[PDB]
Every structure is written in structure tokens, then in C-alpha cells.
């Protein structure tokens, strides 16, 4: 080891190639500086960087020994002086997730096009899921200052080509995500509980109308809440237990929460909804934190008011901050998932803010958006694969 | 998309290949099922699995369009019906770390040999460090029930070929490690504080002798502690502050702790040593938990006793369990790092037990061993790379 040599093996993968190459190398005076190997669709690449004595690199003995052993079995091999060559590759700066059902070639092509345009190198591509959505990951190296430009390009691509596209910082700190919060209505839970309550008063129509306006950001949250809850005035509080029982989880929600617990996540919900409905479900799903509003009840009857203070847009963010503090988790390591303008400050406050089948106003400011009715696609954005999830679930 | 096709591109890497391939594919009716791409030492492999109409896969139009575009620029491409082909690869079951200074080809060759013998498939190899030690990772798929056999083979290889070799479960749960404890003397800190104390009494020699015996497991811990501390009887308690100031961290310790905090680890020390020495240093290093013994002091003078109960071998384990409980971390997600037989139950109790420049008795039962005087090599065993550490440190 005075000078360095690079050995590169390619061809149709076969058993024992790796061991054969190094058993051959061991017969010379060779120390390893770096090894890289993968098989993709039965294509092997094995790159080995060694430093051997000056005496050895000058020698066709090493060359012949390697060339003969590799070519004999049917693969190809190259061998060259390195010296100027980098020993270990630098980490990727970002990772890009592409989800779709389907992901067209045109879509992915548009992603690649935008990436290359900004002088972004693609370091790796792999699949992260084949179900319930096709999911692909590109780890990339982005030129400094170009990432803002990159997110913009890819947002345009996402809207035009019908795929979800998320860009995330791939640094150590930023991917040690430890805490997550979900909005409840239309996020963790299907539908709007307040509409289910309003149905019992025969007011479902107007309340659905206002809820939709409020989640689009057209109405101030607090006022929209007071007005909608007013429509409940008179209902017996028994109605809370009924609606609570009719609640169905978002598809994939159980898988999501279960996988997140496996990963050691602190988990919570932040809702402008009602705690008597949310806390039963939260306890059962074994959550770590709840923040919700509260219905005023007099004589076992709903008054049509909520008990202040009212969790509003700023309030959600404040609750995440609070939760993160109780939990000892920096904001950069928090995740928030919501569907409404109700959620904008919570998503913004989060290290990673995820819009889930969301109104435009939320999508507009979210770190990432998800457009299929499967909450587990959240897991793909947290660096988890379908196979990993299924593997862990198989062991029970 | 009625049937599936596999497109595989190989050759010397060039800019815009990825985008070119998909721009070409977009002109046909093609949806993506899976994409995999890497460049190793300028060798590109791009494997793309698509489902195109039955009408299209029968067509030399797609074939010619792809073959022409790829071959024009100098790369090679194959195209074949798949159908029977798996869409996304399953996760690796284990990962193997190889550290050495140097790592000979013979060493690595022996690792590969043992791996292939047990019918273990190598899914990936990469470098994880080039400094202060050469570090390589092999993600592998191990046949069920063969892992015990694998750890044994590789332990033999490790001892015979002069490299550290660790086998770890590569499951979701088992690599979401969230809590770590260090032994202090000869682990986080250089040397044995008790010998530094004994030097002040002119007893360094005998105390060094007993400490060595005790860390090899030849002497019961509690008795070895009482006897050694007895030799301090009479020293003024001022001696505590002096020795404390002479304490030097193990090389790489600051990097280790700093990186672990970036990763959101709960961090602590469990020592049979003395809290008046350890707690000052622990506070400064901003640790989350300390367990230590305590020197008995009368009239500002050491009595030569310790204040019971005495943290012993079982005691260390008990402290880790306690810490894990305060922290809300399951034992499978805990890490312990020690050098002595003093540490055997703590290492055993830990999800990942790491022996650091350790006596044989500790190495014998450890999940993994490390033989170079660099504490940061712990980070490599936790799935961190040198480049990642340097990257995060560069941003300050
Ligand atoms: Mg909502
Ligand atoms: Mg020790």
C-alpha cells in the first residue's frame, strides 16, 4: 500500500463472485480502502478500491490473476491506477419521493428533466412501494441554493403529471424525525365529525357548507366553529357517544400508527373538534397527546357553544410546540399531517409538514402533499418501505 | 398495462441518461412499476420495470425507440418480457459491519467466504468510513435459523483476521435505537479514575492490579471495589477535584455524543465509579442520566468506604432498565457500551451491547466488539457514516 488501484467487476450476477474476487486479491499484498456492490435485475456491479505496494500495482500478476478469475466465470472486469480517485462517496443532500397510481413514464420523465435542469445529480433510485400506491425514491445531490428552485419545479410537475412529489433534506438531523401529530377530521378519521353531529339536528347541509368554506380558508376558524356548533344547541349529549361509535379510521391509519410506534415516535392529535369524541379513540389507539376543543353541556344537553379558549389555526401550532416540549423533541424533528387551512400554522411550525388530501390553501404551504386516500403513504415520506412494513408486521 | 416489460441500461455513466430513457418511454403507453438505479465507479445500472399494453410489448416500436436512444449515446440496454418477475425487492434481514486498520483483502474474503457458506445472500456492500478506521457494510439476507451460525463464523473470522465484525438485525424496530449508555472508565474516559485516586495515596500499583483482575471477571466486583477504595482511606476529599480535572475523554467521544444528540438519542453513563467525579463531567457533556457509586467522606477526608448500595454487575443492568423506563424506551431499542466484566449484564440487557477495547470476558458475550481506541466507531455500528457525520458537523 503505497499507491492505489481500482478493480471494477460487472456482468450477470452469479453466486460466489464477491468471495472469489477477494480470495484472489488476498494472494497479493492488498488492503481495502472502499468496497461498493449491488445487484439490480441480475446485473452485478462490484467496485473495489485497494492500495497495494508500488511493487504490486506495477505487476501484471495481480491484473492477470483478477482478469483470469473473473473472465473465466463469465463476468467482465477492469483494473486501473486510481490515486486521484475519491475513497468514499459523500452523502446525498436531498431525497425526492414520487408516489402515484399510476406513475406514468412521462411523469417520472418530467421529474428527471427538472432535476437535471438544475444541475442536480441523481445518486440513487429505488422503489419504496408497490402498494397501495407505486412509490419511488430518488436520493439526490443538489447544488447549494438551488433547492428552493427544485421544490418549485417539482410542484409544477406534481400538479401537471398527476403524481405526489416531495423533496426532503437528507441530513442526519433532519431525518431523525421523532414526533408526529395528526389532524383528526378528514385526516386520521374519515369525514367531518361536526357534520355527523349536525345530521342529528337536521342541520347537516349548512354545517357541511361552512366546514368546507372554513377548511378552504374562506372563513375565520373560530367564527366558523361557533356558528356550526350553535346548530347543535338542544341535542342531548348522548349524541356524542353515538357519533363517536360511527367513526371510521382513514384507510391505512392503523398500519401508520403501528409502524410509527415501532419506530419509537411520540404520537398525538391536534384537533379543533371535540375531546369527548377524540379522547376515547385516542386512548384506544394508544396516543401520547391530545389537544381538542370542548363542547359546553348543560343539564345533559348541548348548549351550542364551545368552552374557551378555542383551538384555532395559531392554536394547533401552539399545541404541537407544547407537545414537542413535553416530549423533548426539537421542532425540526417533528411531523404534522393535516387536510385543512385549519392546519396551516401547524404544518408550517413542523419540521416536516404533510398535507393529506388537502384543500389548495394547505397544499400551497405544505412541505409535501399526498393525494390518495391512504394514510400509510405518510410512512413512505418518513423513509419507510412497504416491504419493511410488511416484514415487521409478519413477525407480529 | 396488461403485461410487464423489464428495461435494463448499463455502461459508462453519462449525464441525462435517466431523463432520456423516460422521455423516450413516455412516447409509449407506459406506466412504472419499479425503478432502480445506481452509479458505482462510473458504472451505471438502471433497471426499469414497466407495464405497457399487450399491444405495446408486442411492438418493436418501443424496443427500437429505447435501443436506438440508449445505444446512440454509448450505453447498452436490454428489454424483455417479465410477468413472473418480482416488482420490488424484499428488505435485507441483517447488516454486517467490518471495521479495520487495515482491512486486508484476506480478511474481507474470509467474511464473504463464511457468508456464502451459510447460504447468506449479499444484497449490498458500501463503505461507511475511511477514517479513523476503514469501515464497510454488507446488508445481507440470512436464511432463517442460520444467523446464530453466522455470528459464530464471523467471530472466528474477526479474531483470526484482525478486524472488528458485527452482525445486526436489520428490521424496522431493531434499528430504531433511541437510548445509549456508556461505561465511564476505559470507555468514555481514558484510564481508570480509581487508579488516579490511588496514585495520590501512593497505592496506584496494587489498585491497578486489582482493577485489572476485576475487569477481567477474576474478582467479584463489590469486594474489588471495597478493597480498592479502602486504599484511599485518609486522602483529603480535595483529591476528587484534582483527579476530575486530569480526566481526558476517549478519542472521538465528543464527536460520538454530539452525533448521538443530533440523532435524538437519550444519553447516559452507568459506572461503579464515583458520582462527584462523573456528575461534573456529565453535566458539561449534557447527559440525560447518571448512575454511579459514592465515596464516603468524613470531616472532608475519605473514609475508604463507599456509601451503599453498590452499583455492581447486576446493578449496571438495573440502571439501564431504570433509565430506559424513565425515558420510555423499550430494551430492544437501547444501546450499552462498556469495556469490562463489570459491564456484562448491562451489555446483555441492552438491545445492542457493544464491547469497546474490552476484556475477553466482555467480548465473549457482547453483541459486537470494537478494537481501535476511537469511540466514534460506535457510530458506524449505529448505521451512521463518516461522511454523514462530517456533513452535519460542517453546517455547525
Ligand atoms: Mg381536518
Ligand atoms: Mg470500564
Distance CA B264, CA B270 (A): 19
- Determine the distance in angstroms separating the CA of A312 from the nearest CA of chain B, rounded to an integer: 30
Of the candidates A260, A318, A255, the one whose C-alpha atom is nearest the C-alpha of residue A288 is A260
- Check whether the bond before A20 is cis (ω within 30° of 0): no
CB atoms within 10 A of CB B368: 24
A-chain CB neighbours of B140 within 8 Å are none
Considering B76, B147, B169, B183, which one is annotated as catalytic? Answer: B183
* Ligand 2 geometric centre to CA of B263 (Å): 25
Contact A131, A379 (CB under 8 A): no
Grid cell in block for residue A153 = 419545479
Give the span between the Cα atoms of B50 and B36, in whole angstroms.
12
Cell triple for residue A320?
404541537
CB A290 within 8 A of CB A320: no
Alpha helices in chain A (DSSP H): 17-26, 54-57, 60-73, 105-117, 147-161, 193-199, 204-215, 221-230, 238-246, 253-262, 275-284, 313-327, 344-349, 360-363, 377-381, 386-394
Note whether A9 and A80 are within 8 A (CB): no
B199: burial class by Cβ within 10 Å (0-12, 13-18, 19+)? middle
A109·B23 Cβ contact <8 A: yes
Closest CB to B40: pick one of A26, A45, A90.
Answer: A45
Q: How far apart are CA B329 and CA B332, in angstroms?
A: 8
> What topology is assigned to B92-175 in CATH?
Alpha-Beta Plaits (3.30.70)
For chain A, give every residue range classified as CATH 3.30.70.260. Answer: 1-91, 92-175
- Inter-chain residue contact A395 with B171, CB threshold 8 Å: yes
Tally A–B CB contacts below 8 A: 245
> Could you write out the DSSP letters of every residue in B163-212?
-EEEEEE-STGGG---EEEE-TBTTTBSS-HHHHHHHTTT-HHHHHHHHH
User: Min CA distance, A361 vs chain B (Å)?
Assistant: 30
Question: Which residue does chain B place closest to A106, by CA atoms?
Answer: B26
Q: At what angle do helices A147-161 and A105-117 cross, to 10 degrees?
A: 160
Among A residues 89-108, those touching chain B with beta carbons less than 8 Å apart: 89-91, 102-106, 108
The answer to whether the CB atoms of A37 and B389 lie below 8 A apart is no
Q: Is A34 on the interface with B (CB under 8 A)?
A: yes
Report the Cα–Cα distance between both ends of chain A, in Å, rounded.
50
Q: CA A396 → CA A240, A371, B285, distances in Å?
A: 34, 30, 39
| Experimental technique of record | X-ray
Which cell numbers hold the place of A223? 367564527
- Torsion, Cα of A156, A157, A160, A166 (10° steps): -90
C-alpha cell at B225: 471495589
Instruction: Report how far residue A151's alpha carbon sits from residue A191's, in angstroms, rounded to the nearest whole number.
Output: 30
CA distance A200 to chain B (A): 42
Distances (CA, A) of A238 to A205, A234, B195, B207: 21, 11, 72, 74
Find where cell 410477468 sits: B83
* DSSP category for residue A189: B
Closest by CA to B343, choosing from B322, B320, B316, B370, is B316
Q: Known binding site for substrate: residues of A?
A: 192, 228, 271-272, 316, 342
Q: What value, to the nearest 5°, has the Cα angle with vertex B308 and ends B307 and B309?
A: 145
Alpha carbons A329 and B236: distance in angstroms, whole number: 43
Whether omega before A102 lies within 30 degrees of 0, making that bond cis, reads: yes
Strand ranges inside chain B, DSSP E: 3-12, 31-40, 43-52, 76-81, 94-100, 103-104, 121-129, 134-141, 164-169, 179-182, 266-274, 289-293, 295-298, 301-306, 334-338, 352-356, 368-370
Catalytic annotation present for B183: yes
CB contact under 8 A, B26 and A105: yes
Given a contact cutoff of 8 angstroms between Cβ atoms, the answer to whether B296 and B302 are in contact is yes
Cβ contact A91–B388 (<8 Å): yes
Sheet holding B368-370, edge to edge: B289-293, B266-274, B179-182, B334-338, B352-356, B368-370
Q: How many CB atoms lie within 10 A of CB B35?
A: 26
A324-344 b/e with 16+ CB inside 10 Å = b?
beebebbeebbbbbbbbbbbb
Q: Under an 8 A CB cutoff, do B112 and A22 touch?
A: yes
Resolution, given in Å to one decimal, reads 2.3
Interface residue A236 vs chain B (CB under 8 A) = no
Catalytic residue among A164, A185, A343, A376: A185
Q: Measure the CA–CA gap between B92 and A231, rounded to whole angstroms.
A: 56
Distance B271 CA to ligand 2 centre (A): 8
CB A240, CB A196: distance < 8 Å: no
Backbone angles phi, psi at A358, to 5 degrees: -105, 150
Residue from the list B49, B88, B124 with its beta carbon closest to the beta carbon of A386: B88
Of B5, B89, B78, B11, whose CA–CA distance to B45 is shortest? B11
Beta bridge pairs of residue A39: A44
Cell of A10: 460487472
Q: Active site includes A183?
A: yes
User: Are A393 and A379 spatial neighbours (Cβ–Cβ below 8 Å)?
Assistant: no
Three-state SS for A290?
Answer: strand
Distance, CA of A99 to CA of A115 (rounded, Å): 16
Give the β-pairing of B76-81 and B31-40. unpaired
Q: Tell me which residue of B125, B273, B383 sits closest to A35, measured CA to CA.
A: B125
- Identify all chain B residues contacting A30, using CB atoms and an 8 Å cutoff: 104-105
Burial of B55 (0-12, 13-18, 19+ CB in 10 A): exposed
Residues of A in contact with B23 (CB under 8 A): 109, 112-113
B392 to chain A, any CB pair closer than 8 A? The answer is yes
Report d(CA A274, CA A237) in Å as an integer: 12
d(CA A270, CA A266) in angstroms, rounded, equals 13
**How far apart (Å, rounded) are the C-alpha atoms in residues A208 and A195?**
6
In whole angstroms, what is the distance from residue B170 CA to residue B367 CA?
14
Q: Please say whether the beta carbons of B97 and B135 come within 8 A.
A: yes
d(CA B48, CA B62): 14
CATH classification of A1-91, choosing from 3.40.720.10, 1.10.510.10, 3.30.70.260, 3.30.565.10?
3.30.70.260
**With contacts defined as CB-CB under 8 Å, which chain A residues touch B88?**
127-130, 385-387
Tell me the β-bridge partners of B38: A124, B45
DSSP A372: S
The CATH number assigned to the domain with range A176-396 reads 3.40.50.1000
Q: Please judge whether A385 and B129 are an interchain contact, meaning their C-beta atoms are less than 8 angstroms apart.
A: no
As annotated, the residues of chain A forming the CATH 3.40.50.1000 domain(s) are 176-396
CA of A365 to the centre of ligand 1 (A): 16
- For residue A125, what are the contacts with CB-CB under 8 A and spacing of at least 6? A136, A137, A138, A139, B18, B35, B36, B37, B38, B46
For A113, A163, A383, B209, B221, the CA distances from A99, given in Å and listed in that order, are 17, 6, 13, 63, 57
Amino acid at each position: 500500500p503505497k499507491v492505489s488501484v481500482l478493480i471494477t467487476v460487472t456482468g450477470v450476477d452469479q453466486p460466489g463472485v464477491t468471495a472469489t474476487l477477494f480470495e484472489v486479491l488476498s494472494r497479493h499484498g492488498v488492503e481495502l480502502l472502499n468496497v461498493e456492490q449491488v445487484v439490480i435485475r441480475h446485473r452485478l456491479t462490484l467496485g473495489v478500491l485497494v492500495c497495494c505496494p508500488a511493487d504490486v500495482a506495477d505487476g501484471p500478476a495481480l491484473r492477470h490473476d483478477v482478469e483470469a478469475a473473473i473472465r473465466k466465470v463469465g463476468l467482465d472486469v477492469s483494473i486501473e491506477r486510481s490515486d486521484d480517485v475519491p475513497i468514499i462517496r459523500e452523502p446525498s443532500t436531498h431525497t425526492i419521493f414520487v408516489l402515484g397510481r399510476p406513475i406514468t413514464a412521462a411523469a417520472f420523465g418530467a421529474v428527471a428533466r427538472e432535476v437535471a435542469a438544475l444541475g442536480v445529480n441523481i445518486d440513487l433510485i429505488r422503489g419504496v412501494s408497490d402498494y397501495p400506491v407505486i412509490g419511488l425514491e430518488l436520493r439526490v445531490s443538489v447544488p447549494p441554493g438551488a433547492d428552493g428552485a427544485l421544490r418549485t419545479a417539482l410542484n409544477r410537475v406534481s400538479s401537471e403529471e398527476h403524481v405526489d412529489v416531495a423533496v426532503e433534506d437528507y441530513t442526519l438531523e433532519r431525518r431523525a424525525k421523532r414526533l408526529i401529530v395528526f389532524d383528526v377530521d378528514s385526516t386520521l378519521v374519515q369525514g367531518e365529525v361536526i357534520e355527523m353531529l349536525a345530521a342529528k339536528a337536521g342541520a347537516e347541509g349548512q354545517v357541511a357548507a361552512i366546514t368546507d368554506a372554513a377548511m378552504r380558508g374562506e372563513l375565520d376558524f373560530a367564527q366558523s366553529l361557533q356558528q356550526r356548533v350553535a346548530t347543535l344547541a338542544g341535542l342531548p349529549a348522548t349524541v356524542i357517544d353515538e357519533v363517536a361509535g360511527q367513526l371510521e379510521l382513514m384507510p391505512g391509519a392503523r398500519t401508520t400508527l403501528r409502524t410509527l410506534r415501532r419506530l419509537g415516535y411520540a404520537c398525538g392529535v391536534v384537533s379543533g373538534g371535540f375531546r369527548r369524541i377524540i379522547e376515547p379513540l385516542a386512548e384506544e389507539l394508544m396516543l401520547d397527546y391530545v389537544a381538542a376543543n370542548e363542547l359546553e353541556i348543560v343539564d345533559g344537553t348541548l348548549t351550542g357553544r364551545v368552552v374557551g379558549p378555542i383551538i384555532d389555526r395559531a392554536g394547533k401550532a401552539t399545541a404541537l410546540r407544547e407537545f414537542a416540549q413535553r416530549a423533548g423533541v426539537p421542532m425540526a424533528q417533528t411531523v404534522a399531517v393535516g387536510d385543512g387551512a385549519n392546519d396551516i400554522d401547524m404544518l408550517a411550525a413542523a419540521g416536516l409538514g404533510i398535507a393529506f388530501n388537502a384543500k389548495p390553501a394547505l397544499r400551497e404551504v405544505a412541505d409535501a402533499s399526498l393525494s390518495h386516500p391512504y394514510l400509510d403513504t405518510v410512512l413512505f415520506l418518513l423513509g419507510v418501505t412497504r416491504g419493511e412494513i410488511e416484514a415487521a408486521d409478519a413477525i407480529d
